[PDB]
Ligand binder design. Structure first.
Ligand code: UQ
Ligand code: PLX
Ligand code: NDP
Ligand code: UQ1
Ligand code: SF4
Ligand code: SF4
Ligand code: SF4
Ligand code: ZN
Lengths: 115, 96, 156, 176, 144, 63, 342, 208
């Protein structure tokens, strides 16, 4: 039993429905975000970034964790829609000023001690 | 007691001086390297040794509560002088 | 040469006009702005030097960063710095704006406003006294007295 | 015990009613405010002529830091690191080793002045009055790096301001 | 009593050595009050007091026209005041250094320096410690 | 009512920690050894968790 | 490798990169990006300047504390160069002026100064030198600018044999004199083009690509004596490029043909400006000259850089030139131009 | 014992103990523990399900009348299975008294919003959510209050680092403020201050 209480959803199906609703809202919002914030990206890039952000935690199997993730996504969408966010906040999702970090063993061995 | 290095850089009391190879000397170009002129080791070496007529002497650094904590120094070793661990002043007993 | 003399005199005149009429933004962040107000108070009367607060960035010449700059605030400070018409000057006032100060190791504080904007003068203290801020302002005036814009243009 | 600030009732006789009507129609209280501003116009202002005149300070004033010496010229600091331990901003960095003559002395004594809150805890913690906050407060710089003091800078400040620092200490050490 | 004020102004003009000194002190310091001379620096600064003024205006300094290397006829700042007169001028004591001289020490600066920021004499920070790790020096002779 | 989850607890996606400081870190769970300079034992009563030591280098300015 | 110059950290603002670079001409269009890329990873940057220090202020937030040092230099004084390169292991030369001043001509800025810099750097012990040239540098070019470029690169190669020479083609960016220059022409009314721009081919390159290529050439041990050509991915006819520029800015495009002599006469008139000229005869010559094809030289792709097309970065330069009515238009609205490729 | 030691008021201590017994008797369904400290402060430990009934009773009862919410905050104790401790500080003007109500929760269990009981609670709950990540059910408008827009993590948690994971700076190439992983010129220096000799025998724990 494990005697746990929910936040919103009882099982993973309701959680998936909430995830789909949040994804629909973000997908609808992306073009307006590109227009209002005067972004130099395309709408396709924004929608790809939204999809990548959703896929970053596609491995979650706890409905409570999914519920909290959806709540946080709604918070971020509310920040974006009301323009509380600025252009810098929107563009932090893309990491434009960070040099790529190599992932193979040899490059890591060459640069430093970090594993 | 500042002495110059082969590159002309002044040597600090701690002894730090940039090497010829080192690139950090560029920070002093069109500017100066701050060095204190009063080497405390040479100044404390100049003080005369006090002669007292007891085996134990007390030092507080002078000025009462304006000096250092008061400590007591043993003066039994005839071939040496007692040194204050705070001030550096030296004391001894009259020999010869 | 005649041209060198003319440009030197014109540079002197323009520099005098700029430094004698210094209008800072009405802008403060934290504790240090109280000392800024005390510098505007009768005892020191910064207005007697020609220094007048103006609210709009388009009508301001100097920005005094007086208080802690947090991560939430940095884009706004940068934005009102960008909207100042040139020439413009930045004065960093207090430990917090200088290098972070008491909050240097916090997760939400910019470690010095000079990561966000270029700074002309740094005023030390937590907070600096109104007299110290007056000294820094007069130092900025003396720095403006030293620029050579027309002479350098003529030497090109 | 309490009092009311706005719990009064105006008089309703003809005399006071006409008084209030004359106040409304002839602007008496506004004239009074104008009179107060006029009175202030003819007073001597409180402004001083800086930098030729300075604001008053006290011997306890906390300014730019300095390192002090004994009358013989030997340094007072003995690298106990109490000031480093107590500093609420972690603005002091110290390294030490035995000197060539065996003395306990520092090799690094750095104060980040853009980290310092100028609380004066370091000079309270010092047991030999080696580190003090001196009376100077006019030391603004044009670059950030000029406010990162090392040991040479602090010793130079001590040698530069000792004549005033010693007199200031003489005037307050009986309160400490 | 208006004539008294006007005469006070004329004696303010006369007490600065005439019109030339009056205009010099009006354009250098923006003030033409006449005080009593307390003393003079070795750098040329002069110090005055007038106890009839209110607290804060009862002491002042007329800065010198030439300090160590720069012309200070117009460019003056509070950092040109030496420490003893600094203590007197900020009202941290009642006794001027003339009547109450400071203690003489061999290490105290004999020449005061003002704020040197922005000049070639500006302070540049550096690490004062020596090298931590010493590298191995390979031999200078061949091996075969 | 209750929902009766049957998974394993995993809050990593909610803590905001970057991916690098989750997968490449190794924490140590231990009771600290007594400081051999003192006889007191009051610092060896609890368990401690600390992360693996990473690189430290000298600052070009101020060292 | 001199222990103090061994890289440390994760390559951020407070790291050590092992690079000590002197960047001549760091107060220009390319210099700001080069200094920013060097300061991002914790390099010690030395900035020689001749201008008023007010004009070097924007370079200050580019480095950590102590990592950017400003020093005065004179282009015609050898000891200034010696003083500003005494301690560097890399020297990057970005000095150059589009127009000829009374005190400095094209030969002064593209031959004499680069040669003096190269000779002093070789004498001082600098091990890496980066020199910037033009893709169209030709000894018999109709432009004195490009002839001086060719002479200067020859002399620099003579003085510093192991130098790396980079030849870009019409760099475009926010502060560029390329895209911005075309935008400026709208105020007059029409856009005067020689032969209507139908016989000119351009291969512009993004500024960030050039800066990254320079940074990579510093870190590449194989690029010691190499010579690179930095060009964009597409080639455009001048007419199509200007039409696209005007379309992105949403301005009416009115191209009319102007004969070469008439244009030259117009260029001469503008040149008399004591300030920065709006255009010059040399600028008109270089604008209406096709970009050379040099397939025997290594390019951006040989330093790990994928060149950025103009169609992805034009909006960030041309949104400033729009009216309020078109300010919010997005990037994928203006239908990219036709490229004459192969 | 006279000059340097703080005086203790016995009469107040007796009154608070009696009122704690009173409250525990009236609400046995939720009260798990009642405590009175030696410096005269009363604490009530409740089950999370009793947040609303207990607060409502303490606000509306004639013998209670704690009509003001002085403070609401959280404390993080990682060694506990329920990580977070929720503390309500209430003040009674009618009887000139103060009371403290405590409960507990973990990362995934919401707590009922107390906004209906107290208007003042709306901001406090937002701060608890922002700093600790505790979710409050039925909040009128729950969102970040103190942290920067888009900030990730909850900084008041013991596990969160003091300096965070990212910093801000202005970048000239993109012409905006950018966020990057924290790098420090001088690392914060950790001090080990605790004495190896025990200070307070009255608080000694059994040796397990
Ligand atoms: C690097 O940026 C650039 C500039 O910087 C701002 C420029 O001005 C510029 C062109 C130089 C001029 C200053 C363009 C702006 C001047 C116009 C407003 C010309 C207006 C003159 C006309 C006579 C207006 C009146 C119309 C007549 C019929 C009378 C260019 C090409 C440029 O490239
Ligand atoms: C025709 C309409 C258009 C042009 C309008 C021009 C208006 C007339 C110009 C007004 C001239 C007055 C300015 C000079 C007053 C400065 C006084 C003196 O103090 O200046 C000193 C020296 O001044 C400068 O070195 C030079 C100033 C003047 C430069 C040359 C004059 C050029 C006049 C040419 C006019 C033509 C205009 C162009 C026409 C197109 C520096 O001292 P300062 O730092 O302040 O004070 C320190 C503060 N203390 C005293 C309290 C300690
Ligand atoms: N921009 C382009 O599209 C192309 C550029 N290049 C080359 O790139 C280099 C720079 O490009 P860009 O930055 O756009 O040119 P800029 O004119 O924008 O930068 C010029 C730099 O050179 C310096 N400079 C010019 N003349 C002198 C001088 N006489 N003495 C000292 N310093 C001087 C300027 O300093 P100050 O600010 O004091 O003048 C400035 O820092 C040039 O060599 C140019 O030929 C190559 C191909 C195309
Ligand atoms: C009267 O002119 C002044 C202001 O303009 C209204 C200010 O805002 C300020 C700043 C204080 C307010 C509350 C912003 C000062 C000090 C001032 O003198
Ligand atoms: S520097 Fe000190 S006084 Fe100024 S805002 Fe920061 S904490 Fe307040
Ligand atoms: S005054 Fe306070 S903050 Fe400054 S160095 Fe001393 S102890 Fe540290
Ligand atoms: S300055 Fe004083 S407290 Fe600090 S290390 Fe030296 S002796 Fe100890
Ligand atoms: Zn002693």
């Amino acid at each position: 039993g494990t005697s746990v209480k929910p936040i919103f959803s009882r099982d993973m199906n309701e959680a998936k429905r909430r995830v789909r609703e949040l994804y629909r809202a973000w997908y609808r919002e992306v073009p307006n975000t590109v227009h209002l914030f005067q972004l130099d990206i395309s709408v396709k890039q924004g929608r790809d970034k939204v999809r990548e952000m959703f896929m970053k935690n596609a491995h979650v199997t706890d409905p409570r964790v999914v519920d909290l993730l959806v709540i946080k996504g709604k918070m971020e969408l509310e920040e974006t829609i009301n323009v509380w966010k600025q252009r810098t906040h929107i563009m932090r999702f893309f990491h434009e000023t960070e040099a790529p970090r190599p992932t193979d063993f040899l490059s890591k061995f060459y640069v430093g001690h970090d594993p | 007691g500042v002495r110059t290095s082969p590159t002309g850089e002044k040597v600090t009391h701690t002894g730090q001086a940039y090497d010829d190879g080192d690139y950090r000397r560029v920070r002093f170009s069109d500017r100066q390297k701050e060095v204190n002129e009063n080497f405390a080791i040479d100044l404390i070496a100049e003080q005369p040794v006090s002669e007292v007529g007891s085996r134990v002497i007390s030092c507080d650094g002078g000025g009462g509560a304006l000096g250092h904590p008061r400590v007591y120094i043993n003066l039994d070793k005839e071939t040496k002088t007692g040194t204050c661990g705070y001030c550096g002043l030296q004391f001894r007993q009259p020999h010869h | 040469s005649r041209g060198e003399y003319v440009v030197a005199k014109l540079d002197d005149l323009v520099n005098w006009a700029r430094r004698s009429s210094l209008w800072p933004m009405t802008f403060g962040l934290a504790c240090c702005a109280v000392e800024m107000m005390h510098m505007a108070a009768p005892r020191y009367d910064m207005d007697r030097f020609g220094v007048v607060f103006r609210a709009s960035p388009r009508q301001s010449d100097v920005m005094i960063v007086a208080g802690t700059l947090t991560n939430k605030m940095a884009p706004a400070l940068r934005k009102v710095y960008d909207q100042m018409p040139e020439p413009r000057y930045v004065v960093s006032m207090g430990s917090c704006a200088n290098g972070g100060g008491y909050y240097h190791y916090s997760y939400s504080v910019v470690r010095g406003c000079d990561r966000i904007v270029p700074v002309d003068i740094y005023v030390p203290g937590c907070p600096p006294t109104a007299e110290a801020l007056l000294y820094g302002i007069l130092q900025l005036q003396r720095k403006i007295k030293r620029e050579k814009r027309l002479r350098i243009w003529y030497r090109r | 015990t309490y009092k009311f600030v706005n719990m009064r009732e105006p008089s309703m006789d003809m005399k006071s009613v006409t008084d209030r009507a004359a106040q409304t129609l002839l602007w008496t209280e506004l004239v009074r405010g104008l009179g107060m501003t006029l009175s202030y116009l003819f007073r001597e202002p409180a402004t001083i002529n800086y930098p030729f005149e300075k604001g008053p300070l006290s011997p306890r004033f906390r300014g730019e830091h300095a390192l002090r010496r004994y009358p013989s010229g030997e340094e007072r600091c003995i690298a106990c690191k109490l000031c480093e331990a107590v500093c609420p901003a972690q603005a002091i960095t110290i390294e030490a080793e035995p000197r060539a003559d065996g003395s306990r002395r520092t090799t690094r004594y750095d104060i980040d002045m853009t980290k310092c809150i100028y609380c004066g805890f370091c000079q309270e913690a010092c047991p030999v009055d080696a580190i003090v906050e001196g009376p100077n407060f006019e030391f603004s710089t044009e670059t950030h790096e000029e406010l990162l003091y090392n040991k040479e800078k602090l010793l130079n400040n001590g040698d530069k301001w000792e004549a005033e620092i010693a007199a200031n200490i003489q005037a307050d050490y009986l309160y400490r | 009593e208006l004539v008294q004020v006007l005469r006070r102004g004329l004696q303010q003009v006369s007490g600065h050595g005439g019109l030339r000194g009056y205009l010099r002190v009006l354009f250098r310091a923006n003030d033409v009050r006449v005080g009593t001379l307390v003393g003079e620096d070795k750098y040329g600064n002069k110090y005055y007091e007038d106890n009839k003024q209110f607290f804060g205006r009862h002491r002042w300094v007329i800065y010198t026209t030439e300090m160590n290397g720069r012309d200070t006829f117009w460019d003056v700042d509070g950092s040109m005041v030496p420490p003893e007169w600094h203590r007197w001028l900020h009202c941290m004591t009642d006794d001027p250094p003339t009547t109450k001289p400071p203690t003489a020490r061999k290490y105290i600066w004999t020449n005061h320096k003002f704020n040197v920021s922005g000049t070639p004499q500006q302070y540049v920070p550096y690490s004062t410690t020596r090298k931590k790790i010493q590298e191995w020096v390979p031999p200078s002779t061949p091996y075969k | 009512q209750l929902i009766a989850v049957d998974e394993k607890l995993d809050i990593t996606t909610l803590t905001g920690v970057p991916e690098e400081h989750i997968k490449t870190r190794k924490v140590r769970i231990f009771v600290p050894a007594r400081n051999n300079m003192q006889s007191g034992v009051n610092n060896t009563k609890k368990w401690k968790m600390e992360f693996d030591t990473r690189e430290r280098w000298e600052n070009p300015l101020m060292g | 490798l001199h222990h103090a110059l061994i890289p440390h950290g994760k390559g951020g603002r407070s790291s050590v990169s092992g690079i000590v670079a002197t960047v001549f001409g760091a107060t220009g269009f390319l210099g700001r990006y080069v200094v920013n890329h060097l300061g991002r990873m914790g390099s010690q940057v030395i900035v020689p300047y001749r201008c008023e220090p007010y004009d070097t202020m924007h370079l200050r937030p580019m480095g950590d504390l102590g990592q950017i040092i400003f020093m005065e230099w004179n282009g015609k004084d050898k000891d200034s160069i010696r003083k500003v390169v005494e301690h560097s292991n890399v020297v990057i030369n970005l000095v150059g002026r589009e127009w000829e001043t009374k005190n400095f001509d094209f030969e002064d800025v593209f031959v004499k100064i680069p040669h003096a810099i190269a000779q002093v750097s070789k004498e001082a012990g600098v091990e890496k030198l980066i020199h910037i040239s033009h893709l169209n540098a030709d000894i018999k070019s109709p432009s004195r600018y490009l002839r001086s470029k060719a002479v200067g690169e020859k002399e620099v190669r003579a003085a510093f044999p192991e130098a790396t020479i980079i030849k870009p083609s019409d760099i475009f960016g926010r502060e560029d004199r390329f895209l911005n220059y075309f935008a400026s022409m709208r105020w007059f009314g029409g856009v005067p083009l020689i032969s209507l721009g139908k016989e000119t081919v351009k291969q512009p390159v993004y500024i960030v690509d050039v800066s990254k290529g320079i940074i990579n050439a510093i870190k590449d041990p194989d690029a010691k004596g190499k010579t690179f050509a930095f060009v964009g991915p597409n080639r455009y006819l001048l007419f199509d490029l200007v039409q696209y520029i005007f379309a992105v800015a949403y301005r009416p495009f009115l191209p009319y043909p102007l004969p070469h002599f008439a244009y030259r006469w117009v260029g001469r008139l503008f040149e008399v400006s004591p300030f920065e000229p709006w255009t010059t005869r040399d600028k008109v010559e270089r604008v209406h000259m096709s970009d050379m094809t040099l397939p025997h030289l290594p390019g951006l792709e040989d330093l790990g850089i994928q060149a950025t097309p103009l169609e992805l970065k034009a909006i960030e330069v041309l949104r400033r030139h729009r009216t309020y009515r078109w300010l919010t238009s997005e990037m994928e609205d203006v239908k990219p131009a036709k490229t004459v490729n192969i | 014992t006279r000059p340097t030691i703080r005086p203790r008021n016995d009469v107040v201590h007796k009154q608070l103990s009696a009122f704690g017994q009173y409250v525990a008797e009236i609400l046995p369904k939720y009260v798990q523990q009642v405590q009175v400290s030696c410096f005269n402060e009363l604490e009530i430990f409740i089950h999370p399900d009793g947040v609303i009934p207990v607060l409502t009773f303490l606000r509306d009862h004639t013998n209670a009348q704690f009509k003001s919410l002085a403070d609401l905050t959280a404390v993080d104790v990682p060694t506990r299975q329920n990580r977070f401790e929720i503390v309500y500080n209430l003040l009674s003007l009618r009887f000139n008294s103060r009371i403290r109500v405590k409960t507990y929760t973990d990362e995934l269990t919401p707590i009922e919003s107390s906004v209906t009981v107290y208007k003042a609670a709306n901001w406090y709950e937002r701060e608890i959510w922002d700093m600790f990540g505790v979710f409050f059910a039925n909040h009128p408008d729950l969102r970040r209050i103190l942290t920067d827009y888009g900030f990730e993590g909850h900084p008041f948690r013991k596990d969160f680092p003091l300096s965070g994971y990212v910093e801000l700076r202005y970048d000239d190439e993109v012409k905006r403020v950018v966020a990057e992983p924290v790098e420090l010129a001088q690392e914060f220096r950790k001090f080990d201050l605790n004495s190896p000799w025990e200070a307070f025998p009255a608080y000694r724990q059994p040796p397990e």
